[PDB]
Subunit: 32 residues, 2 copies
Amino acid sequence: LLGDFFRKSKEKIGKEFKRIVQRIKDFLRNLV
Amino acid sequence: LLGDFFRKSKEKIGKEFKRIVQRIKDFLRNLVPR
């Protein structure tokens, strides 16, 4: 399972960078 | 809570980079013939 550890740590970091992008788009739409 | 959202998201990303460094140090020690 060492190769299974390196694959699942990367998927986790990519999923949090995507939650930051959607919050910025909601603030700027709420002002109109 | 907008300023509380940005502070807690940075803390979470730094904790995962530190788990990767400790797993690499444990592989290299276990090879010693002794």
